């Protein structure tokens, strides 16, 4: 009867530049090539953030700008031509994706303008995604790539009647199969997915189709599907956790006027198989320093699991796009008699470390910048990025989420009775 509380801080926090989306998206779109137009600053980030994948001949490179590029002593269109040609020679990609960068913004480089021209001359589709640290955080990178992709989707030219549904959000193939085959049990067809395995497989999207988000950070992509493609958006909580997954399905079926057949049981069965992780998770506190936009829906899951969430930090909050996920959180807070947590947008990591110090939470969810300094101070931590690449969607993956959240809890058990938890310099 008193609702969630939303706050907003300085935006001074740690998170991965959105250009990181090249790392999983090139892995996802098999015939793509991601060219990031940027500096050595950007190159250094990706070389280090993508760890071992940088030694797997990735389909990614920096177009590293010289001083001559900044002053226009070198012609930008000519520069892009010479090296987009190198790419076509050595990789024969089916799409080149340009990642616009802070530098390209500040010096105003008309990528959106140069692309359609260069495309024609060269034979290859060029997709521009202005995914920079000026404007966006981490997983928001994928949102700016997928919005841009949505414009490239072709047009029109046992299941129930329902109109074409197309889902959007890059996920590992095993998790597509699992989710697609989850709706197949309800008699819902997945006409396609926005990013498919190959750029050449982008789904048809005609005026009248339905779309649904599978990840919380896909605002722009959703906005685009509605406005530019003319689709109906099923707003629903995201299938992260078994509560998430069932609500997600129930809401799809409801949009289509279907009674969800046989899944109260499918949920309980999933929860039952988590008895041992729930014993550990029960009663303990969590603190989400925000960084990847999964936080509203992980918090909501972890409250149903029996945890106390002390703060939900978030880079950016789309109340329109998350709407249903936010409704499920508040309702979950009521059903578990948990006081409504506060959602901190654009948080101040510094301040947050003071709050953590005051609260002594059992679990801080956070970046590698703060984890070891925290552990050394006796605060247990779980590094947040792993949530973005572990499989966490659908019924079969609720275990995975908990393996993640309990990991530091298990290491605590295994190492108990050895007085050195708080050992700083």
């Amino acid at each position: 009867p008193n609702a969630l509380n939303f706050e907003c801080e300085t935006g001074n926090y740690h998170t991965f530049c959105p250009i990181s989306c090249v790392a999983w998206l090139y892995q996802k779109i098999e015939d793509s090539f991601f060219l990031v137009i940027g500096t050595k600053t950007c190159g250094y980030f990706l070389q280090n953030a993508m760890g071992v994948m940088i030694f797997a001949e990735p389909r990614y490179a920096m177009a590293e700008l010289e001083e001559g590029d900044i002053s226009a002593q070198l012609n930008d269109y000519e520069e892009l031509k010479r090296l987009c040609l190198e790419i076509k020679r050595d990789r024969n990609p089916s799409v080149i994706v340009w990642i616009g960068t802070c530098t390209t913004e500040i010096i105003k480089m008309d990528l959106e303008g140069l692309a359609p021209k260069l495309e024609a001359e060269i034979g290859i589709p060029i997709v521009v995604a202005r995914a920079n640290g000026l404007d966006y955080a981490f997983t928001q990178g994928e949102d700016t790539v997928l919005a841009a992709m949505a414009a490239r989707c072709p047009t029109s030219t046992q299941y129930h009647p329902h109109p074409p549904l197309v889902l959007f959000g890059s996920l590992p193939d095993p998790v597509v199969t699992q989710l697609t085959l989850e709706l197949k049990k309800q008699g819902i067809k997945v006409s396609g997915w926005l990013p498919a395995k190959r750029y050449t497989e982008l789904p048809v999207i005609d005026e009248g189709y339905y779309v649904a988000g599978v990840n919380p950070f896909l605002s722009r992509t959703a906005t685009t599907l509605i406005r530019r493609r003319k689709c109906q958006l099923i707003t629903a909580p995201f299938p992260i956790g078994p509560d998430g997954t069932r609500t997600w399905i129930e809401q799809i079926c409801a949009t289509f006027g279907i009674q969800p057949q046989g899944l109260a049981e499918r949920e309980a069965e999933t929860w039952q198989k988590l008895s041992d992780y729930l014993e550990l998770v029960r009663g303990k506190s969590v603190f989400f320093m925000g960084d990847n936009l999964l936080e509203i829906s992980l918090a909501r899951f972890l409250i149903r699991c029996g945890m106390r969430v002390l703060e939900i930090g978030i880079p950016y909050m789309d109340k329109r796009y998350q709407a249903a996920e936010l409704a499920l959180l508040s309702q979950t807070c009521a059903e578990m008699g948990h006081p409504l947590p506060t959602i901190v947008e654009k948080p101040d990591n510094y301040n947050q470390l003071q709050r953590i110090k005051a609260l002594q939470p059992d679990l801080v969810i956070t970046g590698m910048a703060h984890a070891n300094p925290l552990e050394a101070r006796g605060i247990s931590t779980k590094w947040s990025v792993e949530f973005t690449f572990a499989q966490i969607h659908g019924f079969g993956n609720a275990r995975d989420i908990l393996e993640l959240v309990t990991r530091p809890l298990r290491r605590n058990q295994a190492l108990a009775g050895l007085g050195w938890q708080k050992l700083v310099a």
């Binding site: 190159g43 250094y44 070389q47 030694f55 590293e64 700008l65 520069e79 955080a137 300094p373």
Partner: protein, 440 residues
């Protein structure tokens, strides 16, 4: 515009941060968009740091292009001043800071009026210098600044210590085996009877700096960081320097002879020659290794070497001069200091490779087919693709390249470590070839 995905040396700002992070109570603040703070991730992961990395970002968002990026910078400096109370705060230009061209020098002038902390702007420019040059310059800049404060306040301790003593200059955070090299260097000084006056960047306090001129001389172990500072102290104080990286048996002996000359020149009355004989026979095993049948089996075997100036030049001379290995080419990615490299390795390899393109290095490994590779993590990965062992000798390094086991590269124990590293890479590849030859 160049197409690349690997780089051996990072953006300029990395060097300034590494300098700021090596002192105590020095806080770097970077004028940069959201996300350029990955330096903190790297510090905390690779060095497994128990303390927060004292580097914050004065954020550049769009509201910056509009006279932004010049009001938060003052606010962020003072806020950092009050929350963390540093001795020194260092404003840090990035690639972005570089193309907005705002009067950063001014904010620093302004901000230092409202802060207890001293304030500097790193005299460093993204488009002209890399990580290493930036770090070299930043370290000089801070020394000079605090030398200057001492002078104008009358506190400049200007009298040399009674007994010979030294400043060890250039030990750095995220520096390849630096913490261990530092311990190995203090131990050597102690064995030589030389008090250690001060160790800089690493763990030094800004207030110590004025004691620098009290050293009889300065030792600079790494080619790439500290040269600038050693030179300034020479011209201001007449403080001589020894810049011979004691890395390997023959080079360790040189370093120590040079120290001998420089001290006797100021009246020390010291002969180290018996110390060098005794360490070379008794403490280092490397001389003995060179005579042994193990090393004899390596004669004429082919190697390639690639890394930074210090380690690739020292490795190249250890392979050729101390172990009879055939170094087909030795190279460095320190292009801006290429001439020093070519001179250091003349007569120790057949050919010199100067590049910072990993694919040129890779192709040069495939064409030569050495029996072993000594290089960076990227050369290690070429070795794996080509089925050739690799010993890692220089940065771009990974967590396994920050051991907690004692692994100096310098000094007499450092010679012991290099033997193992070398003999192990050669023998792993031989043992593999034999396995396949016999069965599997």
């Amino acid at each position: 515009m160049k197409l690349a995905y690997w780089m051996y040396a990072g953006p300029a700002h990395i060097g300034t941060l590494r300098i700021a992070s090596s002192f105590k109570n020095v806080h770097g603040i970077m004028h940069a968009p959201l996300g350029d703070d990955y330096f903190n991730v790297m510090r905390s992961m690779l060095e497994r740091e128990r303390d927060f990395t004292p580097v914050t970002a004065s954020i550049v968002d769009r509201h910056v292009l509009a006279r932004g990026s010049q009001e938060k910078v003052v606010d962020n400096i003072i806020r950092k001043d009050t929350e963390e109370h540093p001795d020194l705060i260092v404003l840090t230009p990035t690639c972005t800071s570089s193309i907005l061209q705002e009067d950063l020098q001014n904010f620093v002038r302004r901000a230092s009026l409202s802060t207890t902390a001293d304030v500097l702007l790193a005299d460093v420019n993204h488009y002209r210098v890399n990580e290493l040059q930036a770090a070299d310059r930043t370290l000089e800049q801070i020394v000079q600044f605090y030398i200057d404060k001492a002078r104008r306040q009358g506190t400049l301790g200007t009298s040399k210590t009674p007994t010979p003593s030294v400043n060890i200059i250039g030990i750095t955070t995220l520096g390849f085996h630096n913490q261990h090299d530092c311990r190995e260097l203090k131990q050597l000084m102690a064995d030589l009877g030389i008090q250690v006056n001060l160790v800089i960047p690493a763990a030094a306090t800004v207030h110590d700096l004025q004691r620098l001129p009290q050293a009889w001389f300065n030792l600079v172990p790494y080619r790439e960081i500290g040269g600038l500072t050693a030179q300034y102290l020479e011209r201001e104080f007449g403080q001589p320097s020894v810049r011979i990286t004691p890395m390997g048996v023959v080079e360790t002996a040189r370093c120590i002879r040079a120290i001998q000359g420089v001290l006797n020149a100021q009246g020390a009355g010291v002969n180290y020659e018996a110390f060098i004989e005794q360490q070379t026979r008794e403490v280092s095993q490397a001389a003995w290794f060179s005579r042994s049948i193990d090393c004899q089996n390596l004669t004429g075997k082919k190697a390639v070497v690639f890394g930074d100036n210090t380690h690739a030049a020292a490795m190249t001379k250890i392979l050729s001069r101390e172990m009879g290995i055939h170094v087909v080419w030795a190279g460095t990615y320190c292009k801006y200091d290429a001439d020093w490299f070519r001179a250091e390795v003349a007569g120790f390899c057949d050919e010199v490779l100067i590049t910072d393109d990993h694919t040129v290095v890779g192709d040069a490994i495939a064409r030569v087919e050495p029996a072993a590779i000594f290089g960076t993590q990227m050369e290690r990965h070429v070795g794996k693709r080509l089925n050739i062992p690799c010993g890692v000798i220089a940065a771009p390094i990974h967590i396994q390249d920050f051991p907690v086991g004692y692994r100096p590269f310098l000094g007499y124990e450092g010679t012991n470590q290099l033997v193992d590293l070398i003999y192990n890479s050669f023998t792993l590849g031989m043992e593999d070839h034999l396995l396949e030859i016999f069965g599997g």
